[PDB]
Design a protein around this ligand. Sequence first.
Ligand code: CTP
Ligand code: MG
Ligand code: ZN
Lengths: 250, 49, 16, 1080, 121
Amino acid sequence: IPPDLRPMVQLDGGRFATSDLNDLYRRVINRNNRLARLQEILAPEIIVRNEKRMLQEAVDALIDNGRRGRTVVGANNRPLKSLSDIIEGKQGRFRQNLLGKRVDYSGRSVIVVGPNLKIHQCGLPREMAIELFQPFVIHRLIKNHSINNIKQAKKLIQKNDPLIWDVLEEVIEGHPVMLNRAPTLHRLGIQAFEPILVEGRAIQLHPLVCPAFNADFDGDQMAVHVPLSIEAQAEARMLMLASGNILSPA
Amino acid sequence: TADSGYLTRRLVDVSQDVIIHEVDCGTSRGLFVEAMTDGDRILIPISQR
Amino acid sequence: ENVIIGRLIPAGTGFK
Amino acid sequence: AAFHLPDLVAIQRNSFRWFLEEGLIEELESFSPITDYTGKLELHFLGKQYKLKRPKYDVDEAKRRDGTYSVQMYVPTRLINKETGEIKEQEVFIGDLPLMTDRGTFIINGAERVIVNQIVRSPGVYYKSERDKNGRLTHNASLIPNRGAWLKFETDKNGLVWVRIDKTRKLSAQVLLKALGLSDNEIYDKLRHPEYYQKTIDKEGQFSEDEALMELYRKLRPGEPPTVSGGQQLLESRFFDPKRYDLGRVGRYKLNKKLGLNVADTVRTLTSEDILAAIDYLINLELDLGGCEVDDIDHLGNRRVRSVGELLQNQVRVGLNRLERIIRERMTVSDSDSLSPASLVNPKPLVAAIKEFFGSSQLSQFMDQTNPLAELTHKRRLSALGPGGLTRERAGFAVRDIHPSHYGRICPIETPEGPNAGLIGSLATHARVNDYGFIETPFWRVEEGRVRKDLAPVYMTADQEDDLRVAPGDVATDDAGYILGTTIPVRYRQDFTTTTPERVDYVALSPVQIISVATSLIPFLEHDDANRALMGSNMQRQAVPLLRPERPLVGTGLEPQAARDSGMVITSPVDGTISYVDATHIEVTADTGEKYGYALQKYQRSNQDTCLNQRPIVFEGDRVQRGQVIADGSATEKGELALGQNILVAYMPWEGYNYEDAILISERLVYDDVYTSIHIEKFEIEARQTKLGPEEITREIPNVGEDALRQLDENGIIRVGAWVESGDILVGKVTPKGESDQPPEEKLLRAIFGEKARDVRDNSLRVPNGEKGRVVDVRLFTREQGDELPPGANMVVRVYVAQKRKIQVGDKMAGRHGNKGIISRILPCEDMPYLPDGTPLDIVLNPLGVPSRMNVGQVFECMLGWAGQLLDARFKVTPFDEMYGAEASRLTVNAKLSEAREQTGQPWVFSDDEPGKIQVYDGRTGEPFDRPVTVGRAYMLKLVHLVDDKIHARSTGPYSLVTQQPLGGKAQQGGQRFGEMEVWALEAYGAAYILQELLTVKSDDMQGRNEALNAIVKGKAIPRPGTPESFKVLMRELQSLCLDIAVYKASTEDYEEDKEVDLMADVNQRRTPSRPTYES
Amino acid sequence: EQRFDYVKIALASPERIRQWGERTLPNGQVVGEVTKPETINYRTLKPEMDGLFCEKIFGPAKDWECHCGKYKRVRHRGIVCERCGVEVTESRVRRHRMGFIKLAAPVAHVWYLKGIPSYIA
RNA sequence: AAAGAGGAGAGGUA
DNA sequence: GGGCAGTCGCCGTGTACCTCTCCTAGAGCAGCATGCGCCC
DNA sequence: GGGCGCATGCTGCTCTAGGAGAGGTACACGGCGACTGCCC
Ligand SMILES: Nc1ccn([C@@H]2O[C@H](COP(=O)(O)OP(=O)(O)OP(=O)(O)O)[C@@H](O)[C@H]2O)c(=O)n1
Ligand SMILES: [Mg+2]
Ligand SMILES: [Zn+2]
């Protein structure tokens, strides 16, 4: 396999990290070299068969550990990870890295109850919003209120000039956002809202959408996602907006 | 709670490719629908079904 | 299968 | 007289005391004679002497510098020869042993650690019966030792006795009986039904000693050539060698009790009489004697408790076994003289074993130190997992249930609410453990119907009380004498029955003998649900110590002992006066004339970044008594536990701010410093020595402004007393590094010319984002100062930062009855409802949640607290108070309220039509509400779940090495996972572009990320995606398994065959950096 | 339109396995066979010459810099240094290139020998 | 220009 | 020949999030700084 | 007494290996397919 898929890693100060594929490859190479050297000098044919058997066992352990006989054990009495253990189960490649992923432009926070809201509205804290909408704010700072280049805009954002809040108040106007709760049992567990900036560190939720999410205000948390392209924004507005979900699909 | 999750995963896997692709098939076959009763008491009326 | 390879799913707005 | 509840931390102290007194001495005497292979030169250990050395650091110093609190062990030795004389003797250092703090914990690497107790099976013999799918009742017997191999006996459907040794196939019992050296005459003398064994003898044949040994070798070791001496060796090494088999005192005692033998207590190996008696018992049980019973393995009389000393003995054993082999090998290999005993000992394995046990074990745990209650609770836990216990995956379902033998010994309420529910328990309040490992509980004896409450209560075990009629603790007596009534509920043979008040034998001491410490602090608990009691007990251990704590108006009577038995309250030991008081020192002078001095802790740090503080209570010249409290801790009032505060509460809905368990509070709770807490954090830095050159702690930081170095001093360390925000520099460290990333012409020209300058890098220590506070302590450790620094390091710096926190929107509050909520609004005091007195309220709670959760004890508590505040009385009530009447709690509350109304002279405080309700006005308009509402005083707490440690956001950060997907975790700028259920939801909605953009551009399309970012910045369209990296990784992994998998392109026309496509190739001539960047 | 239409899986012959991890150089020699259980040097953190992390088989470990530190810069578009055999390009190639090992004796694949159906049997 | 690599235990919250 | 019936081994067992610790292996061989004996 | 030479404990470089149990054993529970016994 290519060497960048089995990295060595240079932590430990003076030592090195442990990878399991390298050990199996090294054992295979060692057995092969020993068998070749023994075969070269015409050894008695009762010692060669031993080396052949150990080579077969080493290759078997490299392919699938524990399928036939004993399992190879590392430092502690813990079996090593073979090639077949990478694609097999719930923690394998298929069910962990291909059918689900981690994403950029996402947030998470506690929820409180906001009355006096509209059914299509939500309340977003400013600390989260200034981070989730950075490129749009940079673009609007460059285009209007001509600054210069990207570095000056980043310095302005980091220094927390009062102008960035005036820019952000109109960057987010008309841009939908997606809200999700952890156990998603049906398609009503993700919904699109229109955000307004609030002061605090908690998200405000309309009381009329709680039963669909199955959420109460005693410790729950929610996740926030931001669409990027125009097609995604149109789909979010016309298919998932929270004011158009009146009846139950079931 | 693991049993229900296993059941719903199996259900999702068995029928993940059923998508509306056709407008009409021209079929005269069908199914018979009536109310759901227990003796002389109606548990589910025929108007709801 | 289009999810694994990263294509438009054949349902919804990606129907055609 | 009376009864005094004993110490609650006796288990750990007793275990460690027993270890020190007997365990080490007994363990060192089991291997003392060490011989070489052939001749003389025996080595001896005089284990009875075993001197100890005083520790070099105290507890505080050990915790300051991240050390260990331990002593050193020295044991005298002696080497004799007996062939040429010349005995030699000196002292050998065998290692260092961690010491136990007087609170009952350990200090390992500057951290507090606890050792939990284990519940295991008891050694002995157990019998069982089972039925087949066609009937055919069958019997089995199993013998289990303390350490070694098990023994098994079975009966067949025909009437034959089989033996199963360890994990081997079935064996006739005749070969095992004959191999032991027993004739048929002595076999027939020990069996009460000899005609039953005749079938086995006939159908399996007869054996001699040598034939039996050969058969034993044949079946135990297949393939090897049989030999008489070999089989004898297997038998002796299996069941009789006192180095691989051990019964134990408990095992021998249980065997003698069950089989009715009288073997001496010093024999801890299997004998022939034991096997014969076991077979006899099996045969008698089969033939339905009527005096033989099967055993229950869930019974608490068949289970044992293991504590710290017993667990340490085994590690000592393993280490000594590992050291003995080295000693023998060195003794034989060398062929010189002057072989000193001190030169023959290598104390590496023993030290390694002790360190591994105390640092990386399952039963050694990071202690919970949020408040004194949590620390006390952690020390009294019982666990069924660990080495020699069970496993989470392999645990059945009978182990998670409640057994009738648990009553009075294990609490049936306190238990975890996760995957390991029912596997971890808590010791009951009155329970204690005897010297064999079984749990006892006390009772009072009755004579003819009178409870003898002055006759030294009797402690009994689970199996001792199975044949007696035992009454609960709520039975009411006339004058603490005769039992009233005519039908008393009792427990007989693990069954609830009823009997006349003359056949009763014993009575429990207290009605609250069945629950634990945490559950015993909830008043009016008999009017609540059990699940809410569990939740309240769980949530009482998550409270934060406050600036000025307050003890509850309505208590239960157990707070002073709980506060005292945890080790922060200082009490006067004599009857004298007070001579000197100061914020850090107290002196007591007795009547005789001697003096006692105490020093107090001041703003220290706990395991969970909480605060530990002590303050005086007394004044100068005051007259004190014995046992009086003179100082108290952070979470205690004058001798009592105090976790929350007493506040005014009304039960009514507001304008939607109480919708679903949300809480509305007033602004007085903020500017009066109620629910304000102190937190302390620690930051560390080190100066290593790289191969390129040592790093330096200095002030000259390249490429930084002067405003970033105002608070540093000389060396470059922050000053004590400074205020720091995010991005401030605490310790300035510079690394001399020769990176090679520039053209070499300028570097070589400068090196040749000279003009040495800064070729260093800056990686100094800065405070993280979202933190601020005061610097209160700076500690510096270096060489040339008698300091034990880590190898490869030259300097260590530690900084402590303190912060004060107030309540705010998004914080969690709770009570003792299972009611929890989140604060959603803070109101000015002129907008809250107010009383006829004119006093505004403090908190408003929704009544809708009281009947749904079925916890109505809070109403009792509030209505009693109202009267308590109006009277200055501070009542205390014991649970299960209806044994004195029918409506005891209601009548008590009503009487107290009426008395308060009469005493204060205000007629509006109590009403006769609505006993618990008062009229309330609106602070916005001045109009009264339609109906009176419920008003009282509630005891509330603030939990450790604060919104300041929960808000997180990300735009772009680090990625993983293999899959090239965003990292996960708050502590490293991680992204949120989009699982497959969310993919199902997005597919069901029909939004395909959102899903496609989520899957490729935002996660792992290494080229599309930068294109999207720069298109957004420039205001253009986002180009179409490509192929994610994970698919290519999967293809390479599949090809590594010798599978030919590839992607193909269909042939449009002609006969031409389909062409393979190269996925791992570049299509566009544009750059692909590791992370998105802003170009130009 | 689309780059590919379908995926196919089949058994692998030794010729295909050799073809996966073999590349030639403008010298006349062929590289791709691993013959040493060595990864990196302990003194200087650089890979060995014929082990599991070799730069001749898998690619350079630094962008536009060969192993012997004698060719650098980007103006070269795929030339090979004639002192160590390392091609001068980006390190991303370490995510695709494969190797192979030649065995002294034949061995049996365990997937085709131990299975619910046994295909060899 | 740089910057975190994985793994294993123990304990919690929806 | 023709099985029934019994036994053995492999597969599977909900979702998101937070904090603390310990570990990348272990033994042989040679370099080195220290302690102690020796001759003037 | 003092400088120098040798023995020796301490510790870091190295390499190599890597096998085979020692015993950490006895330790969940249901469904389905592939061998083997002892008889009709
Ligand atoms: N093992 C668990 C435990 C909890 N949950 C989630 O957390 C919720 C628990 O809500 P909680 O507030 O603990 O209890 P409720 O049933 O809502 O009752 P109440 O709030 O009245 O106490 C479940 O419904 C579910 O959404 C879950 O998914 N899996
Ligand atoms: Mg809830
Ligand atoms: Zn080169």
